Amino acid sequence: LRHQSLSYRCPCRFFESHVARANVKHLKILNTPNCALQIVARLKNNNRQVCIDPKLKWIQEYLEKALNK
Amino acid sequence: IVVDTVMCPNMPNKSVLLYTLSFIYIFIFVIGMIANSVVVWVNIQAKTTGYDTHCYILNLAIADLWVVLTIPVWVVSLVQHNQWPMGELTCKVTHLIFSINLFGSIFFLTCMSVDRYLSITYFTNTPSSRKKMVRRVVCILVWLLAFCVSLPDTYYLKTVTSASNNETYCRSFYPEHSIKEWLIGMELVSVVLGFAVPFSIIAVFYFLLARAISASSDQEKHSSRKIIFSYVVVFLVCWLPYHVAVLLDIFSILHYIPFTCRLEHALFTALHVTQCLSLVHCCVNPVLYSFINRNYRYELMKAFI
Amino acid sequence: DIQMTQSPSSLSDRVTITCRASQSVSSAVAWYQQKPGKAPKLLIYSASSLYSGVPSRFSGSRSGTDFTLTISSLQPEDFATYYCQQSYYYPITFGQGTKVE
Amino acid sequence: IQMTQSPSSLSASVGDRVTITCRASQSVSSAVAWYQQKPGKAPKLLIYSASSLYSGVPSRFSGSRSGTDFTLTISSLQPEDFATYYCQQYYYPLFTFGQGTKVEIK
Amino acid sequence: VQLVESGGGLVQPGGSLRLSCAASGFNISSSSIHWVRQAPGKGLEWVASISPSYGYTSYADSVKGRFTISADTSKNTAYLQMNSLRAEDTAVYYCARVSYWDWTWGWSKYEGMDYWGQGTLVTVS
Amino acid sequence: EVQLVESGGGLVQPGGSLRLSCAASGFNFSYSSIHWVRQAPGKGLEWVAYIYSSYGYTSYADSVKGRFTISADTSKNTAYLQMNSLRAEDTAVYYCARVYPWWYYKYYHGALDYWGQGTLVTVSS
Ligand SMILES: CC(C)CCC[C@@H](C)[C@H]1CC[C@H]2[C@@H]3CC=C4C[C@@H](O)CC[C@]4(C)[C@H]3CC[C@]12C
Ligand SMILES: CC(C)CCC[C@@H](C)[C@H]1CC[C@H]2[C@@H]3CC=C4C[C@@H](O)CC[C@]4(C)[C@H]3CC[C@]12C
């Protein structure tokens, strides 16, 4: 029952580092004031909006490539 | 593998919302102090007159006093758009005090709900000493349980400074390989042990009390039938909205809802406003159980004069 | 048994009946009045709280464990054996009765 | 905050191994970057995070972490990469750079 | 709310006997029923008590092991069963009620015995 | 075809100012932050300041604190560094760079991906 001031408001709070490019269908980049840039995905199997961690090499290169166009 | 980009414009009226909420919080704090303080004073002072003052009331008043007393720290952090100028130890200590006292207050609500029915039916022929001993044991156990459930959230809490925003915040830092679980875990403990079980017990054990009073004939002349359902409905109104807002937050986090800046604004506004409404719970408790009762009114009037 | 010592056992108006207990009972003491060949009627329940309808002369008190009942207006009807009581500990133990005459 | 790298100078030749150490006065959670500045050109970017190579950088370059001790390594050194090397931390709001390490020819 | 005792009489020592306390008014499941015996030329003395709601009996240490107490909720009365009377067991028995009130729950006092019956006389020749 | 171009560099006099302009092209300007870096003559690099294009977040080095100001304009992809109260020590080559501030659980990405060609500034009389 923590007060909301101590809370942290971002589209993502955790990540997932098992995703594969073979099972991704729709990336998404959110530029929020209090959390900078964050990513969200949408698999082909679960059809669920799972967050993604920038640490992945292919994820980060693809995102930066897209933002240059 | 399509890609998409979305920006979240900075919120225009956050300042207005937070300023209005601070205006409400100041009154909550002032009235909570006054109400809980007077109840504790009268509870202590009545024992001399000969009343059999009930321990649960005294413990509930103390718990509400502590929760309401921790408001000013929240107000300061709120005026500054939820940034933590103070140190790490302050954040940990304040959160622990808030959590333990708030949980204790809820548990005492449930305890008195059960004790009323037990007093009419079962403890009607128990020596005062035995019932008092049972009450003390229950009070100690409730305090211990509240403290035990509060600790884990405070332990993992730390204060940091945003690399880009260049601002200081306080937030929970759970283990790297279990964050999700921890988050969800705490919320369940914040709901089941917070709302579901307490509310269920209160409703059932006040409905049974109403039925028993209905079976009686002399009591119902002196008692009040609505006021029992008033207790239940007041608890529901105070607490259900905040828990519903929290549940919506978790649904959003797991991406059960499409993301929209408007959704973020509504969730932010709803969470903060409902938090203020929930904290009104500690403000209103003294009236429901103390000011209504005629004996308390008479004793408090005597003390005031 | 939490024996109760009720004294004096006789009396001759400022009437005091002082009753004490072995242990301490948290204001559970009461008082009664049974007239010759009649069932007692309560006069003060808990520490010093009159019973609805009881005259205003009857007045209780407490000193931790030296309980006392007071009647500063002695009226003719108030002649009987008042029995100090305690209910805090089972069994319920009555005083020895202080007959007034 | 001070980020100190050693040695202040270094020497090596073709087909050789080279290593440069970087240390901090506090703890940085793998938040460092290695650049190389040519004689009179704007510095490039070689490694970010701790050991994540950039998109276009060659394969030899690599990074490592041990507490507050980051070691940039070069193997099979080629003639072109004879230029100053810099170490940066971006954990804190205020960034900082290392003094440098000029890899020269024996 | 009136209590009347029925029983008493003369029975030689060693036998059995029963007493009843009839109540008219308040339902018997929200108050406790007690018995108090006053011996000839003696003071009052607690005997037994009961809460009819669940049956939490209690007896004085003198009678513990030869008495029984049971409350009839349907008819709203109490019944005391005696075994093995005694020479001094002769006494005037009263049935009394210790009351309760939910409208003073949080801030309550220590209620006592307010409704006393007239009582039945038991004698042990 | 990412590119940053610096302009507004040349001879200066102490106690004055120069308005350095950093023009960006080839990337989404609003989704990034711009860093101003400095290099003293024949020495190592030295971070000066930076701005965040969208929400206007700024930070400064201790040496240049409260002396240099950064403004942004996403309409023309421009970042202005207004530097006043210059001193002889300030002579250096100034570079403009970008970074996409990704979100890591602990820190924020801060590796300067692209560097401007840089312009020379001289403070003397
Ligand atoms: C300060 C932090 C660690 C704990 C915050 C909760 C504090 C205020 C709690 C912890 C234990 C609590 C005490 C536990 C038991 C009793 C006995 C009761 O008859 C009166 C209240 C009293 C004395 C409580 C007062 C409030 C108390 C001191
Ligand atoms: C949400 C949580 C805190 C509510 C826990 C419910 C509380 C009110 C429950 C938990 C255990 C319960 C006790 C368990 C056993 C007994 C023995 C019985 O002969 C009298 C009631 C008594 C003493 C209970 C009183 C109510 C009690 C204390």
Q: What domains can you pick out in chain D, each with its CATH number?
A: 3-105 (2.60.40.10)
Q: What sign has the CA pseudo-torsion B199, B202, B205, B211?
A: negative
Does B113 map to a domain? yes
Among the partner-chain residues F44, F108, F109, the one whose CB lies closest to the CB of D97 is F44
Contacts of F105 in chain A (CB under 8 A): 15
User: CB–CB of E107 and B125 under 8 A?
Assistant: no
DSSP D90: -
Q: Does chain C touch chain B (at least 3 C-beta pairs within 8 Å)?
A: yes
- What is the count of residue pairs from B and F with beta carbons less than 8 Å apart? 22
Distance B62 CA to ligand 2 centre (A): 21
Angle at A37 between CA A36 and CA A41, to 5 degrees: 145
Residue A25, number of CB atoms within 10 A of its CB = 12
* CB E77, CB E28: distance < 8 Å: yes
Q: Which amino acid, residue A68? A: N
Method of structure determination = cryo-EM
Residue nearest to atom 3 of ligand 2 (CA): B107
Question: Does ligand 2 have an atom closer than 6 angstroms to the CB of B197?
Answer: yes
Strands (E), E73-119: 77-83, 91-98, 107-108, 113-116
Q: How far is the CA of E58 from the centre of ligand 2 (A)?
A: 23
- Going from N- to C-terminal start, the domains of chain E cover 2-124
Instruction: Tell me the C-alpha to C-alpha distance, in Å, between residue C8 and each of C34, C63, C68, C78, C86.
Output: 17, 17, 11, 17, 18
Judge if the beta carbon of residue B270 lies within 6 A of ligand 2.
Answer: no
- Determine the CATH number of domain E2-124: 2.60.40.10
Overall domain count for chain A: 1
Range of the structural domain that residue B233 is part of: 13-304
Helix pair angle (B226-253, B261-286), 10° resolution:
150
Q: Which of E45, E36, E92 is nearest to E69 (CA)?
A: E36
The verdict on residue B39 lying in a domain is: yes
Give me the residue from B7, B180, B264 closest to A31, CB to CB.
B7
Tell me the CATH number for domain F3-123: 2.60.40.10
d(CA C3, CA B52): 22
Between CA C71 and CA C52 the distance in angstroms is 17
Q: What is the distance in angstroms between the Cα of D94 and the nearest Cα belonging to chain F?
A: 6
CB atoms within 10 A of CB B198: 21
* DSSP-based three-state secondary structure for F31: helix
Cα–Cα–Cα angle for D29, D35, D38, nearest 5°? 170
Domain that holds residue A10: 1-69
Contact F31 B7 (CB under 8 A): yes
Say what the resolution is, in angstroms: 3.3
Q: Which ligand is nearest to the CA of B106?
A: 2
Terminal CA-CA length for chain C: 30
Other beta carbons within 10 angstroms of residue F30's beta carbon come to 15
Atom 14 in ligand 2: residue holding the nearest Cα: B138
Are E46 and E118 a contacting pair, CB within 8 Å? no
* Chains B and F touch, contact meaning at least 3 pairs of CB atoms under 8 angstroms apart: yes
Count the neighbouring beta carbons within 10 Å of the beta carbon of residue B146: 21
> Which bound ligand lies closest to the C-alpha atom of B141?
2
Does B6 fall in a domain?
no
Q: How far is the CA of B131 from the centre of ligand 1 (A)?
A: 21
B270 C-beta neighbours (distance < 10 Å), count: 17
CA distance C58 to C72: 8
Instruction: State the residue for tokens 């019932």.
Output: B131
Closest ligand 2 atom number to CA of residue B123: 20
In a domain, residue B166? The reply is yes
Tokens at C71, concatenated: 């009647």
Q: Which atom of ligand 1 is nearest to the CA of B104?
A: 6
Residue A44 is assigned to a ligand binding site: no
Does ligand 1 come within 6 angstroms of the Cβ of B97?
Answer: yes
Complete DSSP assignment for chain B: -B--EEE-PPPSSHHHHHHHHHHHHHHHHHHHHHHHHHHHHHHHHHHHHT-EE-HHHHHHHHHHHHHHHTHHHHHHHHHTTS---S-HHHHHHHHHHHHHHHHHHHHHHHHHHHHHHHHHHTGGGS-HHHHHHHHHHHHHHHHHHHHHHHHHHHHTEEEEE-TTT--EEEEE---TTTHHHHHHHHHHHHHIIIIIHHHHHHHHHHHHHHHHHHH-SSHHHHS-SHHHHHHHHHHHHHHHHHHHHHHHHHHHHTT-S---HHHHHHHHHHHHHHHHHHHHHHHHHHIIIIISSHHHHHHHHHHH-
Does F109 reach chain D within 8 Å, measured CB to CB? yes
Listing DSSP states for C44-65 in one string gives EETTTEEPTT--SSEE---SSS
Phi, psi of F10 (to 5 degrees): 175, -170
Q: How far is the CA of B58 from the centre of ligand 1 (A)?
A: 11
Partners of residue F55 in chain A, C-beta under 8 Å: 33
CB neighbour list of residue B101: distance below 8 Å, 6 or more residues apart: B63, B64, B66, B67, B70, B146
Ligand showing the shortest atom-to-Cα distance for residue B43: 1
* Dist. CA F92–CA F39, nearest whole Å: 5
Q: List chains touching E (3+ CB pairs under 8 A).
A: B, C
The SS3 call for residue F61 is coil
Determine if residue A27 is labeled as part of a ligand binding site.
yes
Strand ranges (DSSP E) for D1-106? 3-6, 9-11, 18-24, 32-37, 47-48, 52-53, 69-74, 84-89, 96-97, 101-104
Residue pair D5/D13 in contact by the 8 Å Cβ criterion: no
- How far out from the chain centre does Cα B32 lie? 13
- Cβ separation B95–A3 shorter than 8 A: yes
Q: What value, to the nearest 5°, has the Cα angle with vertex F110 and ends F108 and F111?
A: 140
Asked if B5 lies within 8 A of F28 by C-beta distance, the reply is: yes
A28 in a known ligand binding site: yes
Alpha carbon distances (Å) from E121 to B154, C34, E80: 70, 16, 14
